[PDB]
């Protein structure tokens, strides 16, 4: 299942409407936002294939920062090898369009908050964007939203040692969305089932 055409409703519930460009596939052009905070949810795949995995990009023109929150925190190389996904192009187009000097600071997550069998990627992205909308200079951590979940080194993604941390992250995610999204509340059971912690576990 995962999350489909749902993020929009949830992200709107979370107060991101004034900054949210929408959901895109891997062809996301980038940001043309020299003066305003902006963000987007971006799939690793093209629309042609259905959608594989969700990430969040956010742009702060005042701090000159582009944020990438991909819930597993994979390296660029692992994004290319696991998902055939490259964000160099959209980063370049964003900086050309949005920065007077054609430069930016890329800030990207290096830790996993999501279990390796979880289908909650899209929901984690929604949570990050609430953090961005409310704390645009420190969306990754040290803020009330992201203080609710704990990243672990991406190298330990499949370690039995950290699985309870990642399960608790998912519990906090859902409860976060219960508290802040009427859309989530009214679809609570269906979304939990379609995004569950062991949803993609191999049999």
């Amino acid at each position: 299942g995962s999350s489909e055409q749902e993020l929009k409703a949830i992200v709107k519930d979370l107060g991101c409407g004034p900054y949210f460009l929408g959901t895109y596939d891997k062809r996301f052009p980038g940001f043309v936002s020299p003066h305003k905070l902006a963000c987007a949810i971006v799939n690793t795949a093209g629309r042609e294939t259905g959608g594989v995995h969700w990430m969040a990009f956010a742009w702060n023109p005042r701090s000159k920062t582009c944020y990438l929150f991909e819930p597993f925190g994979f390296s660029d190389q692992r994004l290319k090898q696991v998902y055939q996904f490259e964000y160099e192009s959209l980063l370049r187009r964003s900086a050309i369009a949005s920065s007077p000097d054609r430069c930016i600071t890329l800030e990207k997550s290096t830790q996993s908050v999501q279990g390796p069998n979880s289908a909650a990627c899209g929901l984690f992205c929604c949570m990050f964007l609430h953090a961005f909308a409310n704390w645009p200079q420190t969306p990754m951590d040290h803020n009330p939203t992201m203080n609710l979940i704990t990243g672990v080194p991406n190298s330990m993604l499949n370690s039995p040692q950290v699985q309870p941390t990642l399960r608790r992250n998912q519990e906090q995610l859902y409860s976060f969305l219960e508290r802040h999204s009427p859309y989530f509340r009214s679809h609570s059971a269906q979304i939990r089932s379609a995004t569950s912690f062991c949803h993609l576990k191999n049999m």
Binding site: R92, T105, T110, M140, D141
Partner: peptide
Amino acid sequence: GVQSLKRRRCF
């Protein structure tokens, strides 16, 4: 939250 890496990029 998550730790993050920062990279200056110019195009």
